[PDB]
Symmetry: C3
């Protein structure tokens, strides 16, 4: 059976009988008729709804944490994948792989109707990137989020605030290793590592970048992938955050992201070399410093450079201290937040130090990234 049809031009002056259907041969679609409206009512090609992703509540993430190792996709979620509609009319359990402390996972909605997580961010095992659509993810943390203001524990579990989907996520290109702070913005769970080019800025159990162990030079600003910065100046850490679509925190962001840590407490000992791990000679375990949002080593471990200036100024004369990129005049200090291991009761979620100019590079200053919260219709 071949239906009556014609071009779009031929349809423009044609009024079909009520409930008559024709085919527009220019568009390769069906046109429904009502006995009254010239041109009828063309229907949409599936191609024009490719990547559709519809949630019942667009103001919240698409998933719910249901236990330390379990999560569900929410009722009312509709997903286009591989030419098909896949929907969930009730909260539906996500099939989990083996979960390993300090690892990010991607959540996929597949064309067989299943929803599943995997450590692989291209495709889950058993599927391809065609039959399985990445719609979100989460961080399986090495310990709990802070229930109050005494840090968390060392029981590996899903961080509820690290749940993201394609329309509810970090603005930064790579959403991995980040957590949503009070619903307002995203923070890196871990302090910046030396090998951030391959690891991203936020990775568990890696060597922390600071004034002595400088980060690798950004490949967007002349770096070759191997060379590190000559030192850990503010300029270099800011440049690295920019590379990854992030920034250093301001004071309002820092107090928010670090809330839940054990206040007026520092790591002790002589160093904090590694993310998510006890410091060298530490008197407090790493988990003492976990925030409400699951930010790890949120205070009392390393200072983070901030994206704010103020406090004491440098000399009122042109000073070439920017790594060969011009001079500064009356340069104010760049903020440092959080305290570090040797600062005893001065560390905390509002600890702030404004004496150090941006060219300074001591062993107890590193960085933590933040970015905007991206919500989409």
């Amino acid at each position: 059976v071949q239906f009556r049809g014609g071009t779009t031009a031929q349809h423009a002056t044609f009024t079909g009988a009520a409930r008559e259907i024709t085919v527009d041969t220019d568009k390769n679609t069906v046109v429904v008729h009502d006995g009254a409206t010239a041109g009828g009512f063309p229907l949409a090609r599936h191609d024009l709804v490719k990547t559709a992703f519809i949630k019942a509540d667009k103001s919240a993430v698409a998933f719910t944490r249901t236990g330390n190792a379990t999560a569900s996709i929410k009722a009312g979620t509709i997903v286009e994948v591989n030419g098909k509609l896949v929907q969930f009319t009730a909260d539906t359990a996500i099939t989990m792989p083996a979960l390993t402390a300090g690892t990010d996972y991607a959540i996929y909605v597949c064309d067989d109707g299943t929803v599943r997580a995997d450590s692989n961010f291209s495709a889950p095992t058993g599927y391809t990137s065609t039959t399985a659509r990445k719609v979100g993810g989460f961080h399986y943390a090495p310990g709990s989020n802070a229930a109050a203001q005494a840090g968390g524990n060392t029981t590996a579990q899903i961080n509820e605030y690290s749940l993201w989907d394609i329309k509810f996520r970090p603005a930064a290109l790579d959403p991995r290793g980040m957590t949503l702070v009070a619903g307002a913005f995203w923070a890196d769970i871990y302090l910046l590592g030396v090998n951030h080019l391959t690891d991203g800025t936020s990775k568990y159990n890696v060597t922390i970048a600071d004034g002595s162990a400088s980060p690798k030079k950004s490949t967007k600003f002349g770096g070759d992938g191997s060379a590190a910065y000559s030192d850990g100046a503010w300029y270099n850490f800011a440049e690295v955050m920019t590379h990854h679509g992030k920034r250093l925190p301001n004071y309002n962001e820092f107090q928010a992201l670090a809330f839940g840590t054990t206040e007026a407490t520092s790591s002790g000992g002589t160093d904090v070399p590694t993310t998510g791990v006890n410091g060298t000679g530490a008197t407090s375990a790493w988990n003492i410093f976990t925030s409400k949002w699951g930010v790890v080593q949120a205070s009392g471990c390393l200072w983070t450079w901030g994206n704010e200036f103020g406090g004491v100024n440098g000399a009122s004369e042109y000073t070439a201290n920017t790594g060969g990129r011009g001079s500064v005049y009356a340069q104010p200090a760049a903020a440092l937040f959080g305290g570090s291991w040797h600062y005893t009761s001065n560390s905390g979620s509002r600890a702030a130090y404004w004496y150090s100019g941006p060219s300074n590079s001591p062993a107890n200053i590193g960085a933590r990234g933040v970015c905007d919260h991206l919500i989409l219709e």
Copy 2:
């Protein structure tokens, strides 16, 4: 009549005659054929266009203010609601309820083809949240926006700049009580109130939060809903804004949002206890301080904490003044903007004071929230 059909796999090697239609039984959709293309041309299921919202001009809000108490939805607006297409081919009047000074309203497009406003943000009277879709809203202000730089009047009316829709709105979760400043960002119409947890940050005729009447403690940062902060330090006001997905203004934002106020003028008297209402012993009525964008008490009433640091510094020694969350060193002042009631000709849209550290808490400092402008395709 049952059409020829089969699975998606069976369709992959099938080329129907030109204008033949088949049914894909995996997808439950129609496939159109052209006599040439194997697989044909699948059509889209309605489920995959749920929540569609299309405007002729996505760079502007979907509505036009047509009078003090009237507004229309713009021509070319197409809305999916309850499985149906509802569109407007000309500017179409919004059915209004009784309008009450200092109240927010939601605009709904309903499946019977009507567009209507209501004080209820779940559903308009006569409808449910299924048959009526919330697409936007506005603030019915207690007075006019400033036509020049002498404030506004006390004639209750729709604030044109407070019009928002789901793809043209404050980035903050709750869009109510906000206005778009020069098309650039949104500002709270009213100064922060004590009861912001229930009222939101921007509400007419409520008790203003300041250094003596501290805001309720944020429930995202340890608050129980009843307890207030011990004082009105910068830290506490910043924390409240974060709770609501907002922030304190910087200097560029403040001069923009306050433009239109009566410059070099203060409220006078001894206090400004309440939003949108005359101050205690005031020599100027509240409306003298309305900005071009309808920001109420924009200057000369209470200072707002700003999200900027600079000016005079605190001691260059560790000082525990953050409410038990660590120490500050060489802490710069946090900006204050706008002036307050006792500052005579020093108040204005560019009034700025940089002597007060963030731990200060006097009766003449409160806060105003701002957030980004969210525009979506």
Copy 3:
């Protein structure tokens, strides 16, 4: 042939045979049936996918620069235009007009299946705004982007980083004359001009706005389109950026956008009056100062006001120096970035000067705009 049909209510209790199609006369759409599901499966009206724009990689712009004067639209791009689906299954060449140095172009996908650029931002020649859909654009620069840290050349060509589309673009209303810096945010290619109301903030070969040649007064803040500001104070430049949905850069943004310029080098001579053109008596041609991202006169030409405060403070007393909009107390300096023509080896991508209060207005300070990167699903 008229198909069986009825209202949506009549459909609710109707289960058609498998592969039966009916027409919902309320919706004017087709409903597919499966012999089991009451109500069947309504299909989507084309109206509900109007403006659909789907890319294979939503994290990147839709176009690729293939030469100095050529570009293609990427494979997998699907576009709704004039009721039709237009797609590209391979990278497809964009038809170019004559290209003129320092000019912005719009890219259109047309309903005849072609993709083409034009200097006109309403419609390309030969088409209307109905048959041709603006989907993006680019800047044809007067010289190359910096390949290293020695600026660029004077060979006119497409700036790859200036490529934008409707879902990958400056957050500012007008995307023209901007470039994406390290994938993080957008910067104005050119310094702010006097005639920014008609030209936008970023235009080639126009008179630069500075402390002597003040910008035209913003028409959103009392300007009439002809009057200029009394001087070039920080306040005025910030106000102009706000008008255009932009802001002055902070330090982290500035070092990023200016990277690639010839460091520790200034224009020389006595002035830099014009964008994209040699300075008056310059010892370095304009192209010496082109950044990696194609930011023109990025350093060593004019200082830009920054959106940051710090450094040396003004008197600790109320000072009416805001153009009649209140007084400032202990006002910190507003940052200046980049250096200017007379600053020899002190200029560069990290050059910063913090001695000048915002009310200052010398001939060697202007402004450059930045804004957020807008990525959409």
